[PDB]
Amino acid sequence: ASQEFEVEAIVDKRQDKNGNTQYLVRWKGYDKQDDTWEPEQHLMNCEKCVHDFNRRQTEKQ
Amino acid sequence: ARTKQTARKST
């Protein structure tokens, strides 16, 4: 997919007014200035990136 | 590429 890029990490999340999630994506090989907020449907090929973010929520760093 | 973990990026 031409718009499917490798994720370094998800580093934040938020809820929209529909109760759906958006994720703050750090893109592999890009700098912080290139981070984006992505709707959850964009993370369908990143289930591990979500599970890893969720695990890191429970740890210190 | 370091992993198979990809997501659609918003332009």
UniProtKB/Swiss-Prot annotation, chain A:
Tissue: Testis-specific. Detected in spermatids (at protein level).
Location(s), subcellular: Nucleus
Domain Chromo: 5-61
Description of how the protein assembles with itself and partners: Interacts (via chromo domain) with histone H3K9me3.
Function according to Swiss-Prot or TrEMBL: Has histone acetyltransferase activity, with a preference for histone H4.
Protein name as catalogued: Testis-specific chromodomain protein Y 1
Part of the intact protein present: 2 to 62 of 540
Curated annotation (Swiss-Prot), chain B:
Residue numbers bearing the 5-glutamyl serotonin modification: 5
N6-(beta-hydroxybutyryl)lysine: modified positions: 4, 9
Protein's recorded name: Histone H3.1
Phosphothreonine modification, residue list: 3, 6, 11
Disease / disorder: Glioma: Gliomas are benign or malignant central nervous system neoplasms derived from glial cells. They comprise astrocytomas and glioblastoma multiforme that are derived from astrocytes, oligodendrogliomas derived from oligodendrocytes and ependymomas derived from ependymocytes. The mechanism through which mutations lead to tumorigenesis involves altered histones methylation with gain of global H3K27 methylation, altered Polycomb repressive complex 1 (PRC1) activity, aberrant epigenetic regulation of gene expression and impaired differentiation of mesenchimal progenitor cells.
N6-methyllysine found at: 4, 9
Modified residues (N6-butyryllysine): 9
Cellular compartment(s): Nucleus; Chromosome
